[PDB]
Amino acid sequence: MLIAIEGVDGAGKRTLVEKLSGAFRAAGRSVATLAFPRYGQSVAADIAAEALHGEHGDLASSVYAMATLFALDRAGAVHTIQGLCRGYDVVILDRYVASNAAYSAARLHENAAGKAAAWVQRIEFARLGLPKPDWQVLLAVSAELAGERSRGRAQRDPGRARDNYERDAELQQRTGAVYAELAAQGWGGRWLVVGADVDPGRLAATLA
Amino acid sequence: MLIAIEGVDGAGKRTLVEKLSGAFRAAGRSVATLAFPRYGQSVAADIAAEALHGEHGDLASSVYAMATLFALDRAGAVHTIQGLCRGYDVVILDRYVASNAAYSAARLHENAAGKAAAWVQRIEFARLGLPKPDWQVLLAVSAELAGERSRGRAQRDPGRARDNYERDAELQQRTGAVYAELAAQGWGGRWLVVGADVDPGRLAATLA
Numbered sequence: 001m002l003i004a005i006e007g008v009d010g011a012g013k014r015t016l017v018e019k020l021s022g023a024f025r026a027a028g029r030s031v032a033t034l035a036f037p038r039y040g041q042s043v044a045a046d047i048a049a050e051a052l053h054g055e056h057g058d059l060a061s062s063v064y065a066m067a068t069l070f071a072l073d074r075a076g077a078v079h080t081i082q083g084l085c086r087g088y089d090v091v092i093l094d095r096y097v098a099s100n101a102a103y104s105a106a107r108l109h110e111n112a113a114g115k116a117a118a119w120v121q122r123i124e125f126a127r128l129g130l131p132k133p134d135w136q137v138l139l140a141v142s143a144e145l146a147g148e149r150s151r152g153r154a155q156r157d158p159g160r161a162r163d164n165y166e167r168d169a170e171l172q173q174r175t176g177a178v179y180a181e182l183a184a185q186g187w188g189g190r191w192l193v194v195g196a197d198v199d200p201g202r203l204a205a206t207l208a
Numbered sequence: 209m210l211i212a213i214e215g216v217d218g219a220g221k222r223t224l225v226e227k228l229s230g231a232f233r234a235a236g237r238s239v240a241t242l243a244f245p246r247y248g249q250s251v252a253a254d255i256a257a258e259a260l261h262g263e264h265g266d267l268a269s270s271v272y273a274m275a276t277l278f279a280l281d282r283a284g285a286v287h288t289i290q291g292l293c294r295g296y297d298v299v300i301l302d303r304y305v306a307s308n309a310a311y312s313a314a315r316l317h318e319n320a321a322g323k324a325a326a327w328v329q330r331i332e333f334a335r336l337g338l339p340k341p342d343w344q345v346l347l348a349v350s351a352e353l354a355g356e357r358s359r360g361r362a363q364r365d366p367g368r369a370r371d372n373y374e375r376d377a378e379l380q381q382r383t384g385a386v387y388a389e390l391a392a393q394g395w396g397g398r399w400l401v402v403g404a405d406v407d408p409g410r411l412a413a414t415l416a
């Protein structure tokens with residue numbers, strides 16, 4: 001089974017991916033994880049973030065370029081994903097294709113039914129042939145509270161800092177909104193909108 | 209030996225690569241070719257050109273994004289290039305890293321000593337570890353005459369058309385200028401500035 005955890009920055013995905021990765025393990029089913037972007041493994045992923053940190057000329061100023069880099073990263077991750085799906089019983093992804101739709105759409109003040117989202121559908125699932133997730137958990141958390149975790153995170157870590165997207169609050173809010181629309185319409189597969197107080201034990205029982 | 213043929217659009221590279229690929233063969237040395245962008249083999253190469261043909265939102269509007277795609281293409285071509293260098297006696301490239309420097313710089317009205325060119329040096333040779341060519345032949349042809357070949361080419365072929373770069377004459381002219389500066393300063397390796405009337409037989413005798 002292929003599960004993808006989605007949500008704005010500082011929402012708690014990394015951790016949910018941890019508490020859920022353990023909930024399934026307490027069930028005999030082997031679990032595997034992979035987080036996107038694949039920093040260090042994908043040059044495109046690295047170039048994308050460094051750009052989000054102010055590098056590589058006018059790169060980040062192009063919504064579609066930034067989207068392409070995150071697609072090209074995953075593209076190089078197709079055999080790997082499939083392998084994981086074959087080997088392990090469960091595979092959890094910290095961010096997946098839905099992220100490109102949510103952020104790209106939000107950057108263009110478009111809604112889930114917009115062109116950017118449709119564009120991500122066409123390039124990633126259809127064209128790059130990236131497997132669609134059996135499940136997409138939208139860890140929904142207010143844009144204000146989520147921003148607080150992003151700010152605290154940058155403050156608690158010396159070699160760290162929010163990027164162009166995390167500094168843009170209105171972007172975070174619109175992405176939250178689009179994430180909500182995508183889940184309602186079950187974009188790329190079925191969605192489950194949980195919360196911070198979601199019980200991993202059950203959530204994992206739901207993911208069958 | 210690794211040779212790269214460089215030059216503006218409609219300069220005659222594709223053909224020179226042909227007349228030269230045969231000149232070496234008439235010398236017992238095996239020859240191999242590869243043309244960049246690697247259409248069909250590199251998604252990034254395809255996304256780059258389709259963008260140059262008006263697709264993928266605001267992609268092409270970012271000089272560095274377009275540059276990155278052409279870099280990521282070649283990146284995926286590192287083991288292949290090296291293999292070719294090991295196997296064959298001669299390897300000719302229809303466009304290489306110098307192209308990213310020349311066009312990116314020209315798009316930004318920068319000169320060869322500018323930031324875009326230095327950026328291509330840092331990312332491709334240094335970072336992606338793409339091998340530097342023993343030779344870089346700058347097939348120099350007036351921007352006016354070269355534009356004529358691009359226009360004629362699009363006219364003689366039904367499923368074809370000049371792209372954003374080929375339609376931009378001033379861009380073609382500035383690229384020619386920057387190509388000239390790069391050759392004089394021997395960017396990325398040594399350069400040989402020939403001409404349309406260059407004798408393949410000799411040119412190949414020069415490439416030792």
Ligand SMILES: Cc1cn([C@H]2C[C@H](O)[C@@H](COP(=O)(O)OP(=O)(O)OP(=O)(O)OP(=O)(O)OP(=O)(O)OC[C@H]3O[C@@H](n4cnc5c(N)ncnc54)[C@H](O)[C@@H]3O)O2)c(=O)[nH]c1=O
Nearest residue numbers: 036037039046049050053070095096099100103160161165
């Ligand atoms: C997968 C995906 C993501 N996104 C968007 C969503 C996000 O806004 C953004 C980053 O994706 P992310 O949500 O995983 O979030 P990050 O902040 O990147 O991830 P982390 O949770 O790991 O952040 P940290 O800040 O803890 O960790 P760090 O390791 O410092 O990560 C930052 C990276 O950015 C670059 N970076 C960091 N510091 C840098 C510096 N000083 N100079 C240059 N580059 C720098 C490096 O490449 C580093 O790996 O990408 C999309 O639009 N589409 C997609 O398909």
Ligand SMILES: Cc1cn([C@H]2C[C@H](O)[C@@H](COP(=O)(O)OP(=O)(O)OP(=O)(O)OP(=O)(O)OP(=O)(O)OC[C@H]3O[C@@H](n4cnc5c(N)ncnc54)[C@H](O)[C@@H]3O)O2)c(=O)[nH]c1=O
Nearest residue numbers: 244245247254257258261278303304307308311368369373
């Ligand atoms: C390698 C490199 C190149 N460039 C710049 C230089 C050029 O301005 C431009 C194209 O690179 P090119 O010089 O090889 O030139 P092309 O015109 O791409 O090559 P050809 O000589 O093969 O052109 P043709 O027009 O004969 O052939 P075609 O096969 O039609 O090539 C066009 C491609 O563009 C897309 N395309 C073509 N028609 C399309 C259409 N209708 N809709 C969408 N996309 C379309 C497709 O991906 C196709 O492969 O890229 C850089 O800036 N940096 C680099 O590192």
Ligand SMILES: [Mg+2]
Nearest residue numbers: 009010163166
């Ligand atoms: Mg982030």
Ligand SMILES: [Mg+2]
Nearest residue numbers: 217218371374
């Ligand atoms: Mg061309």
